Amino acid sequence: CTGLRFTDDQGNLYFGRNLDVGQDYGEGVIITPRNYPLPYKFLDNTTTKKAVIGMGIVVDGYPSYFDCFNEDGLGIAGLNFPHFAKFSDGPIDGKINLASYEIMLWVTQNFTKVSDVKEALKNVNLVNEAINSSFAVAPLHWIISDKDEAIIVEVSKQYGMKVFDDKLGVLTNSPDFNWHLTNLGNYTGLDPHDATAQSWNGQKVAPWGVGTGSLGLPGDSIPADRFVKAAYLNVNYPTVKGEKANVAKFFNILKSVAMIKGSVVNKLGSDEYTVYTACYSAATKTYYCNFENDFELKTYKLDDETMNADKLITYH
Amino acid sequence: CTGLRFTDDQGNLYFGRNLDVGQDYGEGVIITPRNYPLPYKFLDNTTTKKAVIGMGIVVDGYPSYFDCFNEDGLGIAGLNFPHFAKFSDGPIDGKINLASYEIMLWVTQNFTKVSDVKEALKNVNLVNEAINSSFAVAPLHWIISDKDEAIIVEVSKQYGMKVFDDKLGVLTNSPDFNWHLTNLGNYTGLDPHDATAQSWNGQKVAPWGVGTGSLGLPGDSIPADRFVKAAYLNVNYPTVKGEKANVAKFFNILKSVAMIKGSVVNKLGSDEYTVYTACYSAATKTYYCNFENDFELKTYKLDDETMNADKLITY
Amino acid sequence: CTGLRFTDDQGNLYFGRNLDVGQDYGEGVIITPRNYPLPYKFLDNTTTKKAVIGMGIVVDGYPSYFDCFNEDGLGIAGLNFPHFAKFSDGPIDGKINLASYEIMLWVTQNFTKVSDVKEALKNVNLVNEAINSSFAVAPLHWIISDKDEAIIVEVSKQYGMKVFDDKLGVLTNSPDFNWHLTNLGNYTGLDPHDATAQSWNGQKVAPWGVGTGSLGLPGDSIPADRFVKAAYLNVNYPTVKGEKANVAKFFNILKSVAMIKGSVVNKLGSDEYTVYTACYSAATKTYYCNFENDFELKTYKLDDETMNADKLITY
Amino acid sequence: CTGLRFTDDQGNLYFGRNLDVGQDYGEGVIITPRNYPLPYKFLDNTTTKKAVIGMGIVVDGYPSYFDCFNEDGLGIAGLNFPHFAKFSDGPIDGKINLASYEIMLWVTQNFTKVSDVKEALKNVNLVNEAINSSFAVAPLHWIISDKDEAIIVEVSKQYGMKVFDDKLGVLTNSPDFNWHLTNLGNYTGLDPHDATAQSWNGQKVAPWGVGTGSLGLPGDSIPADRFVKAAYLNVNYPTVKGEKANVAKFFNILKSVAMIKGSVVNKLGSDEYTVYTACYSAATKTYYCNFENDFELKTYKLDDETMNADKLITY
């Protein structure tokens, strides 16, 4: 998986992700309207106060999101964090206790600013409990973003709960976020500027085409390598103007780092690949997506009809 | 630039390219209909035998294509070949002489099968002449494909005129095609299959995520590196079924090897990037494309209306 | 810098390092004999319990070692750890306080087995103080080894004092040791076994020579890259028999990952390179070394003469 | 294999090679004195006129060299060139016909200047014949050097006989020399100068140690990769002064690109590795070498005794 966020010149946020997996899970776009029942395992039951949109699965009326974006421009995506993610055995007295799957709607229902999320997370405890005993707990970490900033939330056996500022605007998979940040220093030799003709003891050695400054940029799907390339692309992509251009910029970056079917076979013999790419545009409250087997950009929107519906809206 | 072709389970061809450039050319989609005027510099002027679709510019009613696909399923794309491409000073007696830009319509108008193109090219000479004196000659090489096979055409100072079979179904830029084919042998260590946990003198060393078998696959835009990656992706991508899935597969591969804006700055100070990606589906006679600043898949079709028009149709 | 250890089939230890620097320090081989004065900043002054050999400089009769090996087969090497190393502001009550430079002789004078060093380090505090005001404190981390095991000692602002088991038998420079161990999982695609001929959609793609399984092994001098290569080489080098063969194995590995003069220019404009490579053989109590400008293997030995001298012996 | 040459500040040549193999050939240092019998398969028999030194095997009194250096400062090394090397089925009328193994002594006995070798090779034909029926013909290519220049000699099925100027001073294995020269342009992003701290959208991204400018330099033993690294190291290594420093520089470079035992396992299951490294100093007429299992620098010399001996001198 790869998460990505950036803004245009006017503070309009474009934020979304690739889902990289070994099979399709039957997921689809879900709009959860305002005032929808919202039960919690450890907090009081309530209702949604903000409409949200994103990709996921409905389990007994509960929209279980892989990524989720609210009508006020704040979103969260859960990405795989294997060999690291570990949540608490039960609830802890005094904390805001969330079963880990509940973070998606807890963040999107209760906040519009990442600065407020970061403060509240200081007293949050994520619990190792699924929606019901039939389900496995997903070993996730999360990227959360508004138009001003993005944070990473990781809860691991190694380090406990950590919250990081993410000025790069990207996230992939394991290892932990500080490891990846540290890894970037090993790629300071990258430069968008082309090399020029050289004399190696009088032998003319000159580029054959453009791109020579990025020698050493990895193109494989190892999470550390996708992190380096996604960060490098995001920080060097110019700011662009308008909805079409920013959505296109978003898909240009995420499709560059997509996991291409047939190029990765996991140890169990299945192809791992980017099953979908999705972008939420806060300015238009529109969720854009395409799939490995259908490249057409589909659009779904939070508007006066969908935000005020009396049931979940699901698209398949 | 990257050119790409493959087929589905039933011989339906998907063939197209990324156009990677550092300046604007004002290109757009052009349909050239049947029976349309077709002048040649060194051959008799004639009319089109069949309809074609592709991306290009119109110069005095002449559709000058960057990539061209005919209604019978045969296409050609011209890609940059700097430091290598060199054409003849003038026409040569006894040869079928084409100004280099004329190869696009000569191939697509006169043939259906690459095997026939390959035989005809034995007597073709490409000439260093532009469409008119206001244009420079583009230093190109070409990929030509039907549903059965693809060939590369290169005319260089180094090697003269060469025609290669291209079972990889890809082409990028310089150096020459045999150099790239030879380079692939240095990447035989690539393996789609993930590594598994290992013991390094008793230290458990294990993958953190999937993808470890392709260690060393380059992700930069140097032509040799995009060639390796595009070839690796194309030959390992499963065959898929149906128009939507094959078009999606095509864009999945080409967007993976696209030149991303801001990541390449040429020696003149300008960004080099993939300005458009295009796919021609022979089965539906449809040209699909999107652009760096507009990701929506646009479609243009050779149909009973467009193939029989009286003028060029430009979008 | 790169530190390296391994044993032969008989438990004979070979342990040493490359010194990679941008300026020379005038170092040379020093033997410190038994019963030699040994002052400490924060502990009682004493005399040496054991003879030691290694590379260093002498400061007012004190041998300040870059790497140090005792007559009982235990050694230590200090390697650069910039942007991480941080020692305490003065001594701390209730700890065994050592100025960081004193760790070299504290380890080699007081112990034979790493297991005892590891336990003793639980009560050690390293202090940010140099031997005298003429010297800065070097930002180091250390590898310590006997014939059974090796440990890494790191004291950082980020993590405090950490002691790690080092089954790989290698160390380089920054970042921290756990970062490097974690990085190895990203190189599990490395395989000593050559690839073989492949069919890329019918194009025969075959190796041109041996080595194809290690595609992606980095050859630059960035510390993380030398760590990967040094670890990979050490764990895959077979065990070899006898003194000459093991010393040769040792130099073969460290010269492979040497920092070659002219290939690295630091931000202050100076060449950084491997100024010397050194190997201590515990079995023969012999220190072997060569230098960037003199490749002859020089040898120096702890023996009944040198171990019992009344002064430092310098070469 | 890797071949390497360079000079000091005064035109003194240092020239030699790594021998990287996957079996034992029984090689040793051979001095062939003046006036030694020199039979030819397709030329009149003669005797040696110049003493030579190098590594090789003796076959029924004939010194068959892997590398060979004459007393006048001109040398030649034969390196593997598999999947390319192809010699003629028999002798060709009008040419100077040499069985391929005979080039070693033909070059070193008849010339002192590469410029003269280059001219003479215009009429040389290499023949696919071994010294006797118990040996296979080795698929080699050659680097020949004097103090002024080096040339590469390749005879392939692909290209026939080609002779290249080698300003890089290096050679490895397949593919052909022009392919490798062309490959270097893909590595122009290499820079010995370290990167410095950067701001990635306000995230401070800074090097952890020196070496960052050579990101992408390959460290594996694939011939194309060793060619890039050896060329990069040779052209960036400063010119150094004096015999000791130049021999050291030479071994520093070749040991950096050595094939390390255990890191390469061929398709037959055998370790491929650098079995020896050797350097000929023309100024001292001295052949320096060491071995995978014995790192001591051994020295063998052409002097008034060895050059005038009555039989081969073997070590």
Ligand SMILES: C[C@H](CCC(=O)O)[C@H]1CC[C@H]2[C@@H]3[C@H](O)C[C@@H]4C[C@H](O)CC[C@]4(C)[C@H]3CC[C@]12C
């Ligand atoms: C259920 C197993 C957990 C196994 C484990 O802990 O080893 C998880 C391993 C990878 C996870 C998936 C992977 O993280 C990608 C998706 C992320 C999304 O936020 C949840 C659904 C996901 C589709 C998710 C569902 C749970 C699995 C499939």
Ligand SMILES: C[C@H](CCC(=O)O)[C@H]1CC[C@H]2[C@@H]3[C@H](O)C[C@@H]4C[C@H](O)CC[C@]4(C)[C@H]3CC[C@]12C
């Ligand atoms: C629906 C698929 C199974 C598909 C199949 O039949 O193979 C399930 C496999 C793993 C489950 C997910 C996994 O258990 C993690 C989450 C658990 C949570 O309680 C519900 C949503 C979850 C995100 C959940 C949603 C349903 C999937 C994605």
Ligand SMILES: C[C@H](CCC(=O)O)[C@H]1CC[C@H]2[C@@H]3[C@H](O)C[C@@H]4C[C@H](O)CC[C@]4(C)[C@H]3CC[C@]12C
């Ligand atoms: C080689 C590295 C750091 C230099 C570098 O890698 O750039 C260090 C490893 C051992 C250190 C030396 C060793 O600790 C002994 C001396 C200690 C003193 O405080 C500083 C100078 C010293 C003489 C010091 C200088 C820096 C080196 C030589």
